[model samples]
Target chain A: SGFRKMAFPSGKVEGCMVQVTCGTTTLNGLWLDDVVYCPRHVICTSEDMLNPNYEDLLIRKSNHNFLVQAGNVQLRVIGHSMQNCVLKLKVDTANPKTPKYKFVRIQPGQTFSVLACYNGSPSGVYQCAMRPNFTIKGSFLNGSCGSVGFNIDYDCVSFCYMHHMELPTGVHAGTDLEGNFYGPFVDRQTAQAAGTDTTITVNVLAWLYAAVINGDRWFLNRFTTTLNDFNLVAMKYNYEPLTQDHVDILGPLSAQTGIAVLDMCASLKELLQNGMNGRTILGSALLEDEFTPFDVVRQCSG
Target chain B: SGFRKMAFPSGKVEGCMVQVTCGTTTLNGLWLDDVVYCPRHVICTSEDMLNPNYEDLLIRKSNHNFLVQAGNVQLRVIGHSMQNCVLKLKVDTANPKTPKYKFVRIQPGQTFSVLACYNGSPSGVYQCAMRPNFTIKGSFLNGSCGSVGFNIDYDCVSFCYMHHMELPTGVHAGTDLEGNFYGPFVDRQTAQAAGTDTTITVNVLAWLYAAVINGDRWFLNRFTTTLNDFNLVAMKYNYEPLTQDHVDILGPLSAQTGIAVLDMCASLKELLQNGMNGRTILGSALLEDEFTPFDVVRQCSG
Candidate 1:
C-alpha cells in the first residue's frame, strides 16, 4: 500500500524543432527552440495517481493561480476554484471587551471537500464527522457571527475572519492543507519544466490549527460535533487510530473502556458536561486498574 | 510533548455591553446583545501554540480571505499573505505535440516556505535543498520557460502553469501544505466562535505533486539535489527519516553504506547519470547486497 504505482518517465521522445515568440520572456535570455517529446504522463491526477484500482477526476476540478510578469506588470493568471451556509458573529454589542463566544469559519473547497486536521497535521480530523454534510453547516456555526450568527436559510452565506479560535491554522499561511503543492518557481512557465527530484522544495501539509482538547490521546475518523467523551486511553502507549484492529486486540478491555460518543452535533458546554472551564487535576488512563475523575481544580461559575 | 499548554476559558469576562450594528448581518436573525468576553488568546499564533521552547511570529504574516455577504452582495473580506526567480517552459515550440521535459511549479507561501513532498505525503522533499534559497531561484526554474523562459533579472519575474511534471499536487487544491488549518464555517464571523473541536472541517496540506522515482526506498534530511545514489536499505522495514539515531545505530555500518548526497542542486540528467528514462530494472538498495544496475528496460537517445 505504501508504494504508488506510477507511470515512470522513459527517455524523452524525440520531436520536430520549431521557433516561437512570446509577450514575455524570462529575465535571463534563455530561448527554447521547440522540440517536443511525448510525455510519459499527460497530467497526473488523483484518479491516476491516487487510485489503486483507486482515485478522482482532476481536470475540470483543478485551480491554478500564477503570478506572471507581462513586460512590466505582475499579473495573477489562472484557474477557478467555493461554499456556504450563512452565519455571523461580531464583537458582542453589549460587551465590547469580554465577549461571550468564540467563532470558527468553515468554507467548502471547490472540487474537494473542506476538512479540518487533528492538532493540524497528518491526522485527518474530518473523520470524526457525524454526518456527510458535517462541515457544510451545523455545529460549525453554532455560536459564530454575533447578532445574526445563526443565519442559515440558504448556502453561500459567508462571514469575516477575525482573531479568536474562529480562525483555522492555515489562514496565516495560505495553505488549505488539503493536498496542495506550494511551489516557488518565479512563475508558472518555469513550474512546467521542473525536473525529477529537482532541489525545489514544496510542502504538502499546511493550514495547521491548534485543537487543544481538555483530555489527551484520541483518534478519529471524521469530526462532527463539540466532543469530549473519549476513552482512547491506551493510545498513550501504542498510538494509532481505534480501528477494527484495536477491537481485535482489546476486545475485553475495549468493551469496558468508554469510546466514541461522536454522533449529533452539539455545543461545547453540553458536550463537556458543563462544569469547569479548562481541565483540572490528574486522571490516569487505565482499565481494570483504577479510575479517578479529573479534579476541576478551578471550578468556574456564573 | 503530546499536550499543548493553553489559556483555558474561565468563563466569559463581562463587559460594558454596547449597542453596535454592521451593514452586514448573518442570513439568520440571530443577534448578539453586546457583552464581550476577555479573550483568553487575542489571536492564537504559532508563538503561543507551537511554541514552548519552540515557534515563531505570526503577525504581519497571516493571510485572511473571507467571502462576506454585504447588502445583497458577496464580498471577499480580509488579510494579506510571496516569492522568486524566473524560469519558464511551454509546449516545446518545435514539437507542438510530444515534449521532452516535465515541469513542476514552485511557488512560495506568504510567511511560510515553498516546498515539495516525497511521493506526496508526510515525507518532506525539500529536506534535500543544497542551498538555503534553493526554491528562490535555482533548480526550480532549470528547464522551465521555453523561448525566453529562463528569465531572472530581479525577483517577481514569473511563469505559467501547464501540464507535465511541472504542476505541484496542490495546484488543484487551495492548500499550501504547510501549517494551514482550512475552515468551513461559512465565513469569518462564525469562524471566530468555533469552540475546541467544533466539527468544522479544515485541512493542513495541499499542492500535491508526484515525485515518481526510479528506486524503491530512501528517507531524507531535506531535499537539495538530483538524487539516485543511496544506501538506506534499512528503511524497507522501519520507515522513518534518516536522523541522528540512525547514525548512532549504524555508526560503523552506516558510514560505509552511502547516506545523504544532497550537497547541491543538480539536474535529473546529471544526478541520475544520463543513461535511460524511468527506472531501468533492478538495484537492491543495500549496504552489501548483490548489486545490479537497472536493465533500462526502455532505452533511447538521439
Candidate 2:
C-alpha cells in the first residue's frame, strides 16, 4: 500500500519557471491550479526547433488563438546545415480570431522568424516555429470521391524553396514557398520527372480522400444538419462523382484549405471557450480570403 | 497556505466498494496517479440536474480532446437554472471504425443521468458546456447582404399531447399525469392588442443590436465574402444588390456557419495531434471525411 503519487497542475506561467517534484504522495499525478491568463504579450523561440513536438512549439489558448510577442525573445537554432525556417505571423484583431502558422526559410545562423514586441490580450496562447522536417508533409491523403482524411504538415514553404534551388530539375523538388507542401507544382515537367506515377497517384488519392472523407455521413451527422457547400461545388463543378482532373484540382487545394480552416478553428475553439473571441475575429476574415484564392475562378476556367 | 484539497477520485465506482479517505501529508493539493487499473472510459451525466462547476467540467486530456467518463463524480455548479444539460458519452467499443457521441440528458432526481458506471475507461475531468452565450444575426450594407443579431433565447423544445381533453388558451395551465409545469400561454386577442408597431419596433431593434456588435470587421469579412458569393449569384440572375430577403436569410446563418467551420477545424486539429488517429489505423479516405461538413448548402435553399 506504499504506492504514492503526485500531480502537477495542468498549467504554467509563460516566463516563470515551474518546478514539478514527484515526491511521496498518495497519488502519482499533480494538478496544476488551472489558470486562464490572457498574456498582454508572449515570447516564441526557435528552441521549438529542437522540440519537434507541435505542442512544445505552440501555446494554445482556450480560444485556439496564439499570442506570441516579438520583444526580448531569443531564437536558437542548432544544426549548421539547417537552411531556411520562416515563421509566418498572423494576428486577429477581432474578439474571436485564430493565429496562423507558416514556416519560412531561415538564413543559416540567423533568427528563423521574429515579430515586433506587442502585447496580446490575456486571452490567447502564443507559438514559435520548430525545426523543419522535409521528410514528410504532415497531412496527406489518397482516397475515393466521398472519403476524407486529416494530417498536419509543417509549413515547409521556406524549407521547400531553399531545397528547390539545389535540385537539378526544379519540380516538386521542394515544398511550395506558399507553405503548401502538398502541391500542384508550377514546374509540371520537373514534377513528372521526379515521380510522375507516384505523385499523380498520391494527388489523385488525396482528391478522392478529401471528397469522401470530408463529405461522408458521419461528418455531416456530428458537425451539423447542414451539407457542405464546398462539397456541393466540388460535386457540381469538379468531374461527375469525382474525376482525375477534379482530383488534381480539389485534392491539393481542398487539403490546403482544410488544413488552414482546421488550424483557425482549433485556435478559435480554444479562445472562445475561455471568454475571448480574439482568434476567431482575427482569422475569420483571413480565412474567407484564403478559402478560394482570387485567381481560382480564372484558373478553373482556363 | 498549506491547504489540502481532497479530490474524491472514486466519486463513482462500479462493482467496487471504494472507500475515500481524507489523510494528511506534507503536500497541499490533490494528486492523481496513472494507474493501469484506471483506464479512461465514457460517463454520461446531464448539466441540468448535477449543475457542475465550469472549472470541474472542462477536463483536458493527454490527448487534445476534452473527455469525461460515466460514474459517481462530484461537482458543484456555480450558476442556477441549468436544465436540459446534455452530456455526450464517448464509449469504448471493440470496433473503433465508427465515431459517435452518446448523448445523455440529466434531469434532477433522475438516476439514469447521474452517477454512471464505467467499465472501460477511467473517470475524466469535469467540464461545463462551452457554447457561446450570445449569437449575432442579420445583415451588412453594400459590403454584403446578411443579418446580425446577438443572444436570442435558445428555448428548449417541449412537446405535449392532449388526449381527450378540452383545449384551453393563455398559458397551457394544466399538465398531464406527470407533474410538470407546462406552459405560459397568451390569447390571440392579447397578442393582437400588443399591436403591429410594438412587434415591428422590437424586431427591428433586436436585429439592429445584433448587427452592430456581431458585425465587427472579422465578422464582416466572412459576412462580405459570403455576400460576395451571393452577389455573384444575384448578378448571374441580373438581380438587385443586397436584398432584404437575402439579409434575412444569409446574415445569421453565415455567422453561425463561420463559427461552426472554426469548431470543425479545431476538432480536426485535435484529432490529428493526439487523438484516436495516432492509435488507430485510420485510412486517408476516412481522414478526408473528417475535414468538411456536407450540408451547409441545403440550409440556404430551405
Candidate 3:
C-alpha cells in the first residue's frame, strides 16, 4: 500500500525536471513538518537561554585574619558561562568623589592575588568584566580608541557607583546591603550601559589573627547588592552573559575594600582585648602568637 | 667522628675462626662471641607508635529515629590491632535497657559498610573501632568484651540508644561523652578474658525542635557534654588521620547535633512561621529524616 510509482522524463538533465512519485492520491495538501520530526532537531530560542535568575552578588568575608604568607581570596561564579572570562583589579585611595580604578584581564582558571602592599585603603573597590567576541570588534568604533572605549568607561563608572563606600570606620560609606545607592554620586550613562539586574558583592579586609586558631572569628560586615541598570539590554538579555566582565571589574575593588575592613576589624578585636584602642598595657606580657584571646572574637548575636 | 669500626674474625676452611679483616681503630670490651670491636651503634628507638591515647576516646548522644533510618552511635577500638576491631549496631525495636548490640571485625583495606542494621534493626546506631594490632588486644582486655571470652560476643548490647517520639521526648538513660562505663556489672576478669575495653561511648538521638519543644531540655544539657567530648577528640588529634571509622561515627552525629543546636540558635535563623511543631515547619520537616540534615552537616560547627 505504501509503494510509489515514478514517471521519469528522458531529456537533457539541465533543463528537464525529474520524476513524479505517488503512492496514494490525496485530495488535500500534505504538511509533514509539523507532524513528523526528529526530536534532536529542536532549536532553542533566546528566551529559552535565559533561566534560573541570580541576584545579590557579593564577596565572602573570612571571619579571621589571613597573613600574607600564601593563598588568595577566592571569587565565586554565578549565572555565567565559564569560558574566555577576564578579571581586572582597580583601586581608589585619595578620593571617593573622583575614584581612580584600573583594569586587568584574566583568563579562566586563574586565582588572582593582590600583593601584600595593596592592603588597606579605605573606600577601595574592585570589579571584573568579560569581553565576548561579538563585543570585541566594537572596541575601535568611530576611529577612536586607547583603552578608553565607551564600554570600558561605562563599566568602570557603573562598578564604582554600584559598590562605592566611605572610609572612616570600615563600614559602608554609600551603598547598603540591599544594594540601595546611598553615595551622592550617580552615573546615569554608565548605569544605562552596564546591564541592569546585575548583582556585585564586595568585602573588605578586617584584621590579622593567629593562624593556628581553626575556628577563630574574623572579618567584619560583608555586604551583597544587586546593581540595576535601566537599559533595554538589561531587561531583554539580562546580565548573565555579562558576568565574566562583571567579575573582571569587581574583583580588585572588593579586594581593596576588604583590606580596609580587616584593619578596622583588627582594631576592634585589639581594643576589646586591651580595654583600649591601639594601645597595649605597659609591662603586661603579650600572649603567644598562635593563641587567640577568647574575648576578642566571641560570637555575637547579629 | 661519627664513623669508627674494627675487624671481625674470618673463618678458614676449618670450622675454627682464624684471620681478621681491617676497617678502623676503635676498641671496646668484648664478649667471647665478638673477636673484633665495633663502633657504638646509636640504638635509636623508633618513635613510640602514636598510641591511641585513650584520651581521644569519645561518646555522644544522637536523637536519630531508627524507624526512618539507623544512625551511627559508638566507635570503640579493642586495642591497637585495627584488624581485630569490633563495630556495634543497635537491634531494631529492641529495648534500650536490654538492647541487642551486634558487631563485626574489620581490618585495613577491608570493605565494610559504616552503617549496618543490628540483627536487622531498621533503626540502629553505627560505630567503628581502629587500633593497631596489639592495641586491639589491649582494648579487648579493657572492657570491649562482655562476660563471654574473646569468642567475640557476636551481638551484645546496642552500642548507643535511640529516642523516637513523634513529639520531642527525653531519654531515661545517660552516658559519658568519652569512655563512659556502661556496666562494671560484668567482672573485669570475665571482660579481660573476653578481650575488650570496659570503656564505651553512648550516642543518643537528638532532634531539632521536638526535644526542646517538649521540654526535654535535659537532652540539650547532655548535648553540651557530648560536644565537649567531640571537641576534645578533635583537638587531641589535631584533626588529622580522619579515619573512615571516625567519619562514619562523627559525620552523622555532628550533623544531627548541629541541626538541633541551630534550631535553638535564635539569632542566626528565622523561626518557623506558626510554631506548629509539625511537618509544616522546616525544623521538624528536616528531623523527620534521621540520616543527616544537609545544611549543617559539613560546616564542623553547631
Candidate 4:
C-alpha cells in the first residue's frame, strides 16, 4: 500500500524490460508497439537499480543478488540469487578480461562471500557487477543486471589531496603536512601518469603517517623492525651517507635542514641517556619538533 | 696535629722543588736533586689527579679548581683553587693543540663550571686538565693542579656497539647493531677517506633504530612526518614505483623477495581500518608477523 509509482516510455523499447502481471480493476488496451508491461509492474529507475539500493528492491521481492562491502585491502560480497544462479563477481567492470573474479553458486535464500581486489586500485571507485547469463531463466533483468560502484577510501582524511572524488581538476595531488601543494601536479590522472613514482611513495608515506597518528603499534613495530633490517643491509654495502640532496628531496618535511645524519643519531643518543629526563630536550630542540623523511634518511645515513 | 709521613733525597736538585716551613717539623736541607716533600701536603699521583678522582680529592680539600661532573652532552667542572688560579681545562691531553679547552679563573674559594665536547665523541675516554700556568703560585698542588681523565659513556646501553674502546685496527669505526663487524673496513683514516658515505648512512640508521626501540614518541613523530613529506616528493617526481632492485639494495634485510610498494600501503590501510580489530590480523599473517624492510618495501610497491 506504500509503494511508490514510476513511469517509463511506452513506445518500442531498445533495451530489455521488466514485466509485472496482475489483474487490474479495469481492462486497458495494449500500451505501445514492441513495448510490454503489466498493470501491477514496478519500474525501477537508475537510482533504484544500483548496488545497496538495487538490493533493497530485490530483498523486498525476496531476491538476493549483488551485495557488497569494500575495505582497504579486501572486499566482501554476499551472493544471493533467486535461482541456483552461479554468481560471477567482476571488479572494475563486466569485461571478460578483468583479472579479479569469484564464482559461487547461490541457491535461493542462500548466501556466499567473495573477496574484492583488482589490480592495485586501493583508493579509487571500485565497480563490481553480477554479470549477465548467470541469472534466472538464462535471461538478464533490465534494472538489476548492470554494474554498481563504490569507493575504497582508506586515506580519505590523511592523504586528502590524493583521494579520488575529493580531488579537483588541475590541482596537484601531492601536498605537504600543512596542506600546501608540494609540486606542480596537474590533477590525479596527469600526476598518476607522470608522477607514478611520487604517487606510490607518497601513498606509502601517508599510509604510514596514518599508522603513526592512529598509534597503530602493530604497524609501527613492523615498520621499525623492517627499517632496522634495511639499515643493516645498507651498512653492509657501505652506501653513501645521507646528504643535502636527500634532505632536499624531503623539502619542507624536514625538521631542520643542512643537518648531518649523525647529528640526529647523537640527538637520539642524548634522548636515550636522559631517559625520561631527555624528554625535555625533545620538547626544546630535539624530537618534539616536526621531522621529515629527509630527517630520518639523514639520521639513518650517519 | 695528625699528619702523614714525608721523604726527599737531599742533594743538588735537577728537577722542580717545594719549600715547606713548619714550626716543630722544621726540617731543612738542600734536598735531593729532584726530590721534594712537606708535612700535611698531599702528594698527587698520576691516577689520583684525573677527572672524577681529582674532583673527589678537591672536594675533600674544599678546593674547587678542577672539580668535575660529566653528562652526556656537557661536562661540568667547578673551579676551586686556593689562590687566584686561572684554570684551563683541556680534553684528551695537556698539549696546547689538543682540540678542546675551557678556561676560567678560581679566585680563592670562588668556583666556576666548564663544559666539554670532544669531536662529538660521546662514549670514549675524555681527559680534562688544569694547565700549568693556571696553577697556584707556579707550584703543582695536590687537589686541583693536574690532568683528570674520565669516560663519557651515555651510550652505554643504547649505542652499545659504539661504546667499547677496543676499536680494531684496519676496521672501520662503525659496526653492526649487534656490535659485530659488518664490513671489510680499512682503518679509521682509510675508512674516512673511502667510506664516509657508508659510515654516515649506517650510523644514522642505527641511531634511528635505537630511537624506535626506545619508543621515543617525539623523535618517531618527527621521523614519520618527514617520511610522509619525502613520499610526497617522490610521488611528484613520478619516480618509478618501488621494485625488486630496491629490495635487492636492502638485501637480506627484506622479508619477502618480491612485493610492491602499493601492497604495503594497502596493508597499512588495512591496519588503519581494522584499528584494534586489525590487531588480530597482525598476529595472523598481517602486521603481527615478523617483517623486514623488504617486506615493507614489497607491500608498498604493490
Candidate 5:
C-alpha cells in the first residue's frame, strides 16, 4: 500500500499552488490563485435572434369625404344643401363586441366639425362616414365631391400625414391640429359641379418599403390591415379602382401634393435602403391647398 | 348644369395613358403609366426590434470516473475492488416531474459501462457515481485515486469546463478524449492520504464573467446553481477552500495548464469583447493531456 494517489473531487484543483506527495513521490500542480472556471452555453435561440418572422400591414384609400385636420385629427363635414339635414356617423362595426355611433344635425348651408377618438386599442383604421336621408349636395371642408354624405377613414389622411408631418406624439384621430379646417377632405359637389375637374385616385403603395425599412411585425400588420380596409371601402362605395391612366395624369401633382404618395414611397424606399427620424419632412405635403382638387381639375382640363 | 367633371374614385386614375378634358381646360396630374399609391402605415413594434432578451445554456466536464466515451453517450462504471459494487446513474433530476435512474451491479475488478440516452429535452447535466460495500481504489482510465467512494456532479465539472473549453457540438459528459478519464470528477480521499500534499480549493469564479458578457438571467441562474453545488460538495468533503497561498503557487502553473482557469477566464473576457463562432479553439484546451493533472503535477513538482 505504498502507492497513493491524489484526487480532486471537483475535478481540476486550482489554488495559488498545489503539491501532491505520496510517500517520497511528490506531484505539484500550481496556478495563479485568480484562475476560475469558464462556462460554455448557447446564449439565445437561433430562431428568435438570428431569424424572426415579420409581416406587412398598410392602409390605402382611394377616396375620402370629411376634411381631416392634422393637429387634433378633426373632421369637418360641409353641407352643400339649402335645407337642414341629419348626418349619422359610425366607426369600425366589423367587430360585434362593441360598436360606436354618433349623430349630428346640421343647418342648411353649414359645416359640422366632429372630434373623433380611437375607441380602445389603436388597431384597425378609424373609419367614420356620415349618411344623409335626402340627396343634398355636400363638400368636405372646402374640397369638392359628388354628394352630401361623406366618408373619412383615419388611415387614409391623418395617419398618413402623422408620419409625414411629425404631428406631436399622442396625436391620433381625435387630435385637433388647428382651429381651421386645413387638412384632408372628401370634396363632394364643388369638383363635380365645377364640371372642369377630373378625379385622379392615387393608388398608394408602400408595403414593401415599410417591410424593408422597419421589418417590425406589429407595424406591418397594422399597415396591411389599413390597406385592406381602404380597398374594402372602395368596393363598398362602388368607386372605380385606381388605374394606370390616373397615375399618368397625377404625375405632376405627385411633386406638388403635400406628401406625394409616390414621393413618400420613394423616400421610404430610400430610407429602407439608407436608414431614422426624418419622416416629418413629408408632413406638409398632405394639406388640402397643397394637393387640391383645383390643381387636379386644372391639370386634367388643361 | 352645363358643367362636367371626371371622377377617379380610387384616387390616381391609371388606364394606359390619360388626358383629362374639362370643357377645353385640361388638368394634367399625370405620371407614367407605372405610378402607384404608396401606402403609409406602421409595420412593427418599436420595442421588439429595438431590444431583445437573450439567454445561455452550456455543458462542460473532463475526467469523469464513469468512463464517458462519446459514440452514443455511454458510461462505463468500474468495479475496482474484490467485492461487488452498485453503480447508479441519474440525469436532470433537479425537476421532479420526469426524474430517471438506472442501476447496474459490477463484479470485483470488472468494469460495467452503460449506454445512456437523454430523456426528453437534453438540458441541464448528467451525473453518475458508484457505491460499493468495501473501500476500493479506482482509476478513471489511467488516472489514479485512493481507495474511497467518489461523487461526480456533472453540473459542477461540465459547466466549469464549458467556459474553459469551447467543446464541439454533439460532445457530452461520456465523451473521452484519449486514454485518460477526461471528464469531471471530485475525488475526496486519495490526496488526503498522500501525507505530504497541501490541498487548496480554487473557489473558481465565473458567474461574473457570464453575467457581464451575456447578461442573461437564465444563464446566471443555472451558473449560480452549479457554483453552489461545487461549494456544497467541498464542505461535505471537509476540504479547505482555496486561499491566497494557493493563488500564489498556481501563478506560474497558469502558463502550463493548457487553458489555465485564470487564462481561460481571460480568454473568455477577450472573446466576449471580440466575438466569433470560433468556440472550438477553446474546446481543445480542456482535455486530459491538454490540461492534465500529470502536467500540473509535473509543473508543480519541478
Candidate 6:
C-alpha cells in the first residue's frame, strides 16, 4: 500500500496532518502559504512596448496629423496600479512640408490692403505665406495634414517667371470648355480700352525687382525675393508710355519703391480684368481694408 | 569703430560666417550647419514616466476599470517617431470581491427539483452557487462591480442555520407596516386541520446533514458543505408523525437520502402552506427540469 503524510510540523501539543495513499506510491507536502504574488514592472515589459530601434526617432507616426502611431499603442497590463501618476508623451508628428514652395507675398498697404497665400503637398508648406498675415490664422501645426499645402504648380496669369515650368503659353494660352482662360499675363490684354480709361503693356516683375535693388538694396531685397522676373498687362483709370514702365508697375510697388506712376494707374478700377483666374489677386476696393493700384499677388516657382 | 567678420571656413567650404560687433566687443560664428538634431530614448525616461518608486506597481490606475492611472500616463515626447512601432500597456483594474456570502446550493434532482444561490459585498463571490447552473451566465469579470454579489443577510422564513444573525423570532414574529410576518419558522404552524390536506411537523435541516454522513459518507459530504446546520418546518396535503420526520423534509430530500417516506408526503401539492417569506425555496413543479420531496439547499457558516 502506498501512503503519504503532509503538513509536517514542529513539536506541538496538538498536531494534525493530511494523509493520502495511491496504489503503491506515497506523497507528502507542507501546508500552503497565505501570500499573494503580484506582477510588477513585468507589465511594463511586454511584446507591446514601443520598439526602440530606429535612426529616425521622429518618423511620421500616422497619416492623420492628429492621430499618430502612439495613438494605437495602448498599455495593456495584467495589473493596473498607477493611481497616482500621469503620462503625457508627445512626438512632434506635425512634420510640415519641407520643400521650398513659391507664393505671391503681400504686405498691408496704406490704402487698399493686399493678401497672399501658398499651398504644398504631403507636409504642406504654410509658414512662407503666413508672415504678412501671421495673425489671420494660427500655425498649421494643429491641422498640418489638412492645410492647403500644395505646390504652386498652376501659375496665375498675373505675371510670368522664367524659372517656372509651363508658363501658360505667354500671350497665346486659350481656355477649354469653361470660360476660364489660360493666360492673360495679368487679367486682359485689351490695348484698346473697353469702357476702361487707358491701357498699357509692359513687363512688371522686372520693374519691381529692379527697384528693390535700385532704391533700397539694403532693405527691399530682404522682402522682394517673391517679386522675381515677370511680365504684366494691366489698365488704368489713366494711361502712360511703356518707356515709363507704368502698366508694368501699376500696383503699390510703383510708388512704394523708387519707381513713380500716376495715382489713377494704380487704382483698382484700372487693374487688369483678366479671366478672374490665376491672378490669385487680393485687392482693396473689391475686398475690405486696403491697396493702391492693381493689387495682385503672383504664385512663383522659386 | 569696432567691426567683426565671421564665416570661418571648415577648410572645405567657401568661407562665409556671421560676425557681430558691440562697441569694443565682438562675437563671430562659422557658417551654420545643415543638420537637424533629434531627441530619442531620453523621452522614454522622463519625470513623466511611471513612478517606479511605488512599492505596489499594480494599482487602481483609474476610477473606471476601463481607464487606469496609466491611462493618464501618456508617452509625451518632443518628437514622435514611432511610425513602425506600437505600444500597448495594460493593468487589470477589475478586482472582484473576496468576502464569503452565504447561499443555497442545488444539484440536478431525479424528481421535483430545487435551486439555490448566495450574494456578497464589494468584490462579490459568485462561484459557490454556480456549481449546479454555472452555464446560465458567464463570470462577472467584465462587469464584476455591477454584479448582484451581495451578502445573503436577510433570512428567509423557510429554514435556517444557527450561525446567522437576527434569526426572526422562533415562532412569534408578527407583522407591522405591511402584511409581513417574522416567525412560524416554516410558513404557518397549523396544528389544526385547514382546507389543506395532511400535515406533518419536524426539523428537516438536521435530517439532510445526518443523511449525508449516514448514507453517502463515501461521497455526498464532499458536496453537502452548503447544507450544514439548518432547521425547516413544513406541512403536506397528507399527514405524518414527528417520530417519522416527514413534513420537515418536504421538497426533494425525502427519497434523495437514506430516509424513506410515502410519495404523497413529498408531492408539491402535498407541500407546506407557510407564509411567503424566507423559504427562498426553488421547486421543480414550479420550475422547468428537476427533483423530489421537500426540495431545499442551504447557506451555512462553516
- Native contacts recovered, each model: 0.00, 0.00, 0.00, 0.00, 0.00, 0.00
Question: TM-score of B chain for each model?
Answer: 0.15, 0.13, 0.17, 0.20, 0.18, 0.18
Deviation of model 2 at A68, angstroms: 12
Model 6 chain B poorest ten-residue lDDT run = B1-10
Model 4 CA deviation exceeding 4 Å by range: A1-173, A176-180, A191-302, B1-255, B258-302
Every candidate's lDDT: 0.17, 0.20, 0.19, 0.21, 0.20, 0.20
Higher-ranked by lDDT: 4 or 5: 4
What TM-score is obtained by chain A of candidate 3? 0.14
How are the candidates ranked when ordered by TM-score, highest leading? 2, 4, 1, 6, 3, 5
Off by over 4 Å in 5: A1-302, B1-249, B255-264, B272-290, B296-302
- Clash totals in order: 160, 122, 80, 52, 118, 82
- The residue-by-residue lDDT of candidate 1 on B22-43, one tens digit each, is 2221111000121111111122
- Interface RMSD for model 4 amounts to 47.4
The most accurate candidate by TM-score is 2
Candidate maximizing DockQ: 2
The better-scoring model by TM-score among 1 and 4 is: 4
Cα RMSDs, all models: 29.4, 23.4, 34.0, 33.2, 37.8, 43.1
Can you tell me which runs of candidate 2 are displaced by over 4 Å?
Answer: A1-82, A87-302, B1-302
Write the residue-wise lDDT of candidate 3 on A1-302 in tens digits: 00000001100100101111112110110011111101000111223323311121102212121111101222121112111111111111112123222323322211111100011111000111212210111101111100111001211321111122112211221121122333332212122121122211111111122211111233223432233321222334222222334344433433533433223333333432343221222111221111112111221100
lDDT tens per residue, model 5, B252-272: 444433234443334333333
lDDT measured at residue A33 in model 2 versus the true structure, 0 to 100: 22
Q: Compute each candidate's TM-score over C-alphas.
A: 0.15, 0.19, 0.14, 0.16, 0.13, 0.15
* Best of the candidates, lDDT: 4
lDDT of 3: 0.19
TM-score of 2: 0.19
What is residue B80's positional error in candidate 5, in angstroms? 16
